[PDB]
Amino acid sequence: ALRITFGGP
Amino acid sequence: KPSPLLVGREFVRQYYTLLNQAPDMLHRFYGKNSSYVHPADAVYGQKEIHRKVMSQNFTNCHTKIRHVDAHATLNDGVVVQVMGLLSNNNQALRRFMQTFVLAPEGSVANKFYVHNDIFRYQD
Amino acid sequence: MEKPSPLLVGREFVRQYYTLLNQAPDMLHRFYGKNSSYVHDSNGKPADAVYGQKEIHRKVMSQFNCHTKIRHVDAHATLNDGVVVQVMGLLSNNNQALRRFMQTFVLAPEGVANKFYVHNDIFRYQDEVF
């Protein structure tokens, strides 16, 4: 939940 | 919000590890309006950005990060400059800078997408 | 009415910026606002960056008859009708050795049309880094 993550909307 | 420099570190860490382990998975990071520039013109969107990435034939791509600036920018985004050395497919380490605007994905907390991606070797 | 190319925005700004860094470094601060962020080694390698107009002025006067050679300017649309500009080339302060550098502006609308301010000035000399 508090992990910074990356992906497109 | 989480420290910009933290988003900066983690994205950076995450990005060119993809460039070495799976370029074919790099597209996932990009929106529909996302530009990617490697002058050479911008491809846009996940589908073309993938096509361009696979075209660069990133092979055994080791990467040396010599600095990272990362600052809060408009829309609770983060701009990022990386200064570094990049070899590819066994070429000599070449110096370069890469500018990123990372932007909040909206739906999901602490999640960003790359809105801008600009890379230029200095040589 | 027609919108100005991002790349025009960027080029024009870089023209205007590296100019004023000769005409009146004193007067530079106006480019930046309240949430702005500026930098240009100190100790520990790459120095940290100030923020906000007042703090930026101090840091600018803490260095410039400057002469800039811009070898690369790229510029693109970003969030909130802003422009991210990637600058790259050479600087020499008070008639010294030309220095290689790698910079990144994020410009934003002022909200006067065609008027923009600097939300981020990330400047780095290369020698101090490589």
Numbering used by the authors:
A (entry chain K): 12 to 20
B (entry chain A): 5 to 42, 51 to 135
C (entry chain F): 3 to 42, 46 to 68, 70, 72 to 118, 120 to 138
From the paper:
G3BP1/2 are paralogous proteins that promote stress granule formation in response to cellular stresses, including viral infection. G3BP1/2 are paralogous proteins that share a domain architecture consisting of an N-terminal NTF2-like (NTF2L) domain that underlies protein homodimerization, two intrinsically disordered regions in the center of the protein (IDR1 and IDR2), and a C-terminal RNA-binding domain composed of a folded RNA recognition motif in tandem with an arginine-glycine-rich IDR3. The NTF2L domain harbors the binding site for several types of proteins, including host proteins that regulate SG assembly (e.g., caprin 157 and USP1058) and viral proteins (e.g., non-structural protein 3 [nsP3] of alphaviruses). Most of these interactions occur in a mutually exclusive manner via a common binding pocket in G3BP1/2 NTF2L.
The nucleocapsid (N) protein of severe acute respiratory syndrome coronavirus 2 (SARS-CoV-2) inhibits stress granule assembly and interacts with G3BP1/2 via an ITFG motif, including residue F17, in the N protein. Two SARS-CoV-2 variants of concern, Alpha and all extant Omicron variants, have acquired mutations within the first 25 aas of the N protein, raising the possibility that these mutations might alter the G3BP1-N interaction. Interestingly, P13L appeared sporadically among early variants in 2020 (lineages 20A, 20B, 20C, and 20D by Nextstrain), disappeared in Alpha, Gamma, and Delta variants, and then re-appeared in the Omicron variant and its sublineages. N-P13L, although in close proximity to the interacting interface, was not essential for the interaction. N-P13L slightly altered the orientation of the peptide in proximity to the NTF2L interacting site, raising the possibility of alterations in binding between NTF2L and N-P13L, a prediction we pursue below. Interestingly, N-P13L and N-P13A showed slightly decreased interaction with G3BP1. We confirmed this observation using surface plasmon resonance (SPR), which revealed a lower binding affinity of N1–25-P13L peptide (KD = 2.6 μM) with purified GST-NTF2L protein in vitro compared with N1–25-WT (KD = 1.14 μM) and N1–25-D3L (KD = 1.10 μM) peptides. Notably, we found that the Omicron variant mutation P13L reduced the G3BP1-N interaction. This suggests that targeting sites adjacent to F17 in the N protein may alter G3BP1 binding and contribute to reduced virulence observed in Omicron variants. In contrast, the aas surrounding F17 on the N protein were in close contact with the opposing side of the NTF2L binding pocket, which has as its central components G3BP1 F124 and G3BP1 aas 1–11.
